[PDB]
Amino acid sequence: TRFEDSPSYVKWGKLRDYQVRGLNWLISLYENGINGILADEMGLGKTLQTISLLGYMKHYRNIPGPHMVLVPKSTLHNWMSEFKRWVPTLRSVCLIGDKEQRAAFVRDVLLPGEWDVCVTSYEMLIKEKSVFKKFNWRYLVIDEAHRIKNEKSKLSEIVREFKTTNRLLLTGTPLQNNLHELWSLLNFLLPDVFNSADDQKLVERLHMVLRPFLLRRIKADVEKSLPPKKEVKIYVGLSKMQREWYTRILMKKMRLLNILMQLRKCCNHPYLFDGAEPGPPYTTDMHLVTNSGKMVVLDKLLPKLKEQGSRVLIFSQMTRVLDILEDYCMWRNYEYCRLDGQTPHDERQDSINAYNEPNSTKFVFMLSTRAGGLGINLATADVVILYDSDWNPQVDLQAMDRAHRIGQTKTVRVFRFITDNTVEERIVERAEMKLRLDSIVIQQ
Amino acid sequence: RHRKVLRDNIQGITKPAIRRLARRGGVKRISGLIYEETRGVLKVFLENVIRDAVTYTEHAKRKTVTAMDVVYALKRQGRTLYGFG
Amino acid sequence: LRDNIQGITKPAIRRLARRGGVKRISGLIYEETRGVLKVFLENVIRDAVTYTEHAKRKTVTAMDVVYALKRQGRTLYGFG
Amino acid sequence: TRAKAKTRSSRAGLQFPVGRVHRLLRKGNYAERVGAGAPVYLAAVLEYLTAEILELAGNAARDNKKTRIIPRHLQLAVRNDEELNKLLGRVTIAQGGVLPNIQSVLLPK
Amino acid sequence: TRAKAKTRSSRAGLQFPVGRVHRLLRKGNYAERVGAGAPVYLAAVLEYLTAEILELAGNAARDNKKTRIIPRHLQLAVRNDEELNKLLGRVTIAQGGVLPNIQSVLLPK
Amino acid sequence: RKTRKESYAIYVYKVLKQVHPDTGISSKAMSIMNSFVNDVFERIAGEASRLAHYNKRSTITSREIQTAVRLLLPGELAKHAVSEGTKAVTKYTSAK
Amino acid sequence: RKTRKESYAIYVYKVLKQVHPDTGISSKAMSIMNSFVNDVFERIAGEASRLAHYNKRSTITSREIQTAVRLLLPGELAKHAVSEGTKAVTKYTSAK
Amino acid sequence: PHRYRPGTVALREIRRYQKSTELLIRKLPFQRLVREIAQDFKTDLRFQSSAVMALQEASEAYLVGLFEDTNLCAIHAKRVTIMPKDIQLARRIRGE
Amino acid sequence: KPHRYRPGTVALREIRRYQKSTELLIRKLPFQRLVREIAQDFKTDLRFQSSAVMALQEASEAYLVGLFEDTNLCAIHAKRVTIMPKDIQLARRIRGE
DNA sequence: ACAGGATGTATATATCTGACACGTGCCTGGAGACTAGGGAGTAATCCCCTTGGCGGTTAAAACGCGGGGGACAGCGCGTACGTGCGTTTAAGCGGTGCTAGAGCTGTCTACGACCAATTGAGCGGCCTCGGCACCGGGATTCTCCAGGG
DNA sequence: CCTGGAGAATCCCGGTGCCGAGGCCGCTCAATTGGTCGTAGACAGCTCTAGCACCGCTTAAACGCACGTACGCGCTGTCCCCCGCGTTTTAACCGCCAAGGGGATTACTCCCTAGTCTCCAGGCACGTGTCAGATATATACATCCTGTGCA
Ligand SMILES: Nc1ncnc2c1ncn2[C@@H]1O[C@H](COP(=O)(O)OP(=O)(O)OP(=O)(O)O)[C@@H](O)[C@H]1O
């Protein structure tokens, strides 16, 4: 019902048929007065679509009113740069800094109101809620919709307290653990529609009620590029020391109040515990690697990869072992790159992008389930190694599809090391059942 | 290799915190040796109260210490607390 | 009659102090000791008289004194 | 038929639960039998004490230019009053603070 | 026919009267009901404490060259033991006296 | 539905409205008053129980309550509370 | 004859001859011991009554006595007292 | 002439009275004081001798403990002679 | 050249400020960790309600404040202004600990 | 000894929010009426124990006096704490995930209250003797001058 | 300024009276045995609330450091106040007698409270909306502290 090609107001524009038809879809939703979720799963892109939508709104019938975009603090510079280098004609401001800087910024920019789009983080939004409420908001963009996936959370209640002429939601995997978080998202979208919580009951009902307010397509069935990743599980066994650790802790001073957690990373590595942690720091030598079967497997796999690609990028679950392995790779006879929550927010975006190099010969990059955000594709990566899996299959999906952006024109292999007769089997089965629920809800 | 213990929990009671307590009491100048003595006194007081509270919780055949248990222990020691039950 | 606190004499106060364990006594201690003794005795006797009046008796007993002292947290052993 | 029910608090002119106090006395293991006048007397005494402490606390709250009563106001009322201080000598009032006092030797001169 | 009357104290092998303790528990209004083992437990505890204090007092009387325990011996025993001292911290023993101690500064230089 | 809990809150509020009509109370203040009333009740009831046990009597009466008030309350408070209790018992007996 | 009075004097004498076979006790010391036993009985029984009320029950039991002994007596006294009471209850149930 | 140094007789008296266990105030003056104090609370009140003896015992124990605490305060102030200020500090820290 | 207050004024200002406010002065998390460490010795496997720790902190703060009051009294008795462990020990000895 | 400057603080004003006061429904515990029974009031009697007094004696208190040591004020000093300023850290709040464990329900038994009959355990009343208090005398020890060490 | 005697005060040994402790008797009341019955709580089952282990971001708070100034502490002189001793007076102490008050016991009666059944309204849980308070922000006042003259 609209143009089939890119509008003549975008700059550096290479948006394809999927993005132009999504733009037409969003504009039609705006015309008929319907909000919704841009459930673009993967590389096809959502920042381009959101920016193009806002730019179309300005460059067509004059709606210069307030507009707000919510991003994690790890993507503020990225989003501002995308806005500048895609649609420079649109005006954007950023609310970031300490108390004095934020007060100065609101006083010198927000109340004068020369802005059209404001890019803020969740934390700053919570900080200056009384400041933002004084405006008649029109369009609200929330990235990573699973942040507000539940009610009774301060951000969700605050963002409901705002009044906007239109709403818009952005996510990668709208369904995570159950239909109630999806119902929470839909409640934020349309408060007056899905007021109630409630084979024919589901699946079909979900499809027919989500088609009007959602767009779903797969990069595999759209781009036909980006050769598929191959996932292989390696069933490993735990050493006898780990077995006796596991049995003794399960049947039993060190505080033990959480059976599942305390009997978790056991299969990963025993000395991840305290009490019998490695004692005197004699030196960093061949001590930690010998104690774990999974560590043995990784140390065997590394040569087979360095006789080839040697640009793996590794994944593990616990931040301790994350930093342990990070400061271990450098010692062993390798080099690394750093990505974890310790790193100050603004420095990471330039640092990691700079570390993306034509050649590094460093052989190691480490990223956890919760060490990275949404960007920086490692097209140079070739192998994905998952030391342990998280409860939520969506987190692992995001982790392993982080390197599956377009940059990756080569097939990539994911390795999932798994032990036996331990809690990791329960983690795997829960993840599999959740993934099956997600597939039956969305794909079918 | 990176594995060590940072501090003990009695050092969580901080010198500026003890100085604020002394200011509320009404003290002007504080000697340097007050702090370890105050930590010891607080440790003794808490050990007594916690022993009594755990005794009550064990009689209840529970495993969670409640505000009621703390109030009963304090009333036993003669330091009735109003506002918790 | 009256003037019976003077029956508590300086030598008796000195003996009490020497049992306490003190060596030198200031000259103004005696009136202070008489005052504190008067306060203590007044409290205890008032409680005992309340107990006796509740009993509807006219004689104050060792039981009354002991009950009053126990109420004040000064339990006395050796009188019942 | 039967007469219209009058609460014994209404009978005694009180505003405290004579019936509930009677039940608590009977169930608290303080004796075998309880006189009818005992809960009435107890409720009257409780009412007097509550009224006294509340009056002092309300005066303090007004002195602070406030229309609600907080534990700070309750502590400030209980202290500065001798009888209530003696009654509540060994009692901590949560979030009530301490009486403002400085020993006169500490004041500079 | 009936068996010979065996005392509950005899059954538990004690010297304190389980029957008297039971009657005192029932007539004291501490609770509605009193179990079978509670008097036995309480009697054993009372006997243990009495034996402790009597042993300490007997040693004290032996040190003083007598064969009759008196309140001075009881006071010496109770104040010379830390556990019993904390148990009886708020208690006065008639005709007991005080522990001999002199602060080391009063002694002549 | 949670199990009901009994408290003196409504009566404390009525007494507050009687003494300071245009004033309010806070939740923590109400909890403190709750604990205060429970404490005073327990102390007076225990004193009366011990009195009755001492005098070999099995009933708690207004005499016992008055004696407990005299023992536990310091002076002028005792005098005024005794006047209050006498007036209340007189009203309860005169026409009820 | 005058009305009978009760005391723990005979049992105190039995325990004295049990622990020290060649010692006697005066009347004032016996009165002191009697009052001591009464006071300890009062403390333990009152604590057990409070425990039963706190846990919403109507029976004083051996567990309540044990818990009261733990609350009231310090340290090694408590350990020995609990051991002695447990032996007594064990033997009483065994021989009953 | 033989005169002891000013302070040895004090230590001899300290030892003698810390070894003795009998009362130190005179019984008739104490009894007259007790009756004088009881005169205000009720007129024509009679007494038992055991009551007066117990009152004297408790008064002496209280005063002995007070003097011990007073000695501690005076030694803290680097003195040997105890003072009214020391007595008042002891009472204030105890809680009067 | 920069303005400095003479020793004995900022302390009085803090005294007034803290004797006027009613907040708790010890940090909550270290106190909770200390409470858990102490409770670990008597009986392992213990959970705490959040209200229990607040009650414990309230009682601890009140006890310490009263102790410091008495310690200040002892220090003033000794013709001093600085409090010392001797004053703390004397106050505890008189109060009966 | 004041003037002025810098600092901290009290005060007036406008916004926004979460907690308190009010209403509504509902149910469980208190009020009305009644019946039995035993605890307490009342009277009367008895005896013991409290008070009042009187005299003789001796220990204890009151008064004076000389002198030594401890309290108190002053002065000097050299050091440990208060005050301010930069840098790091960890608390606080927010989300995440999970599962234990506290709390309410229903059933069933075994345990303690109640009663009746018996009897032996403990209590008041007696008497005799050895442990203790007192008295006296000798050996021992601590203190205080005075000197020659 | 380490010794050596006087000279008080104390401990140790032995003899004498005496009075209270300990053994012994009768008696009565309270503990034991036996049996019956109802209810309190033990036990199992399910719900959902709340606690524990963990991460990112903000930012206040803690930590560390340098400078100087009151302050605690040691030392000295003064003098005054308290102690040790002797003497005189006072009253406690003790033994005994006389008398009445009042505490304790016994029986008798009756009124008040326990227990029951029924019914109904007062108190509690749950929602909901509006205002009292906390927050921030900019004046005006109060307080401290230093510095330049001449007190
Ligand atoms: N100029 C462009 N021309 C074509 N495709 C583009 C362009 N810019 C971005 N893309 C698409 O975006 C992919 C990677 O971009 P980017 O990682 O920024 O995506 P995104 O919008 O953040 O997506 P996601 O929905 O996963 O968050 C590319 O593989 C490509 O498919």
Residue numbers in the entry:
A (entry chain W): 166 to 363, 377 to 430, 443 to 634
B (entry chain B): 17 to 101
C (entry chain F): 22 to 101
D (entry chain G), E (entry chain C): 10 to 118
F (entry chain H), G (entry chain D): 27 to 122
H (entry chain E): 38 to 133
I (entry chain A): 37 to 133
Quoted passage from the original study:
All known remodeler enzymes use an Snf2-type ATPase motor to slide nucleosomal DNA around the histone octamer, but the precise underlying mechanism is unclear. We merged the datasets from all conditions and performed extensive data analyses to determine 13 unique structures of the active SNF2H bound to the nucleosome.
In group A (ATP hydrolysis, 15% of A-D particles), DNA and SNF2H adopt a conformation overall similar to that in the structures of nucleosome-remodeler complexes with ADP-BeFx. The DNA at SHL2 is pulled out by 1–2 Å relative to the canonical nucleosome structure and the density for nucleotide bound to SNF2H is in a position similar to that of ADP-BeFx11, which is consistent with either ATP or ADP-Pi occupancy. However, we observe a gradual rotation of SNF2H lobe 2 towards SHL3, relative to the ADP-BeFx-bound structure, starting in the A1 structure and becoming more pronounced in the A2 and A3 structures. These features indicate that group A structures represent conformational states downstream of the ADP-BeFx-bound state.
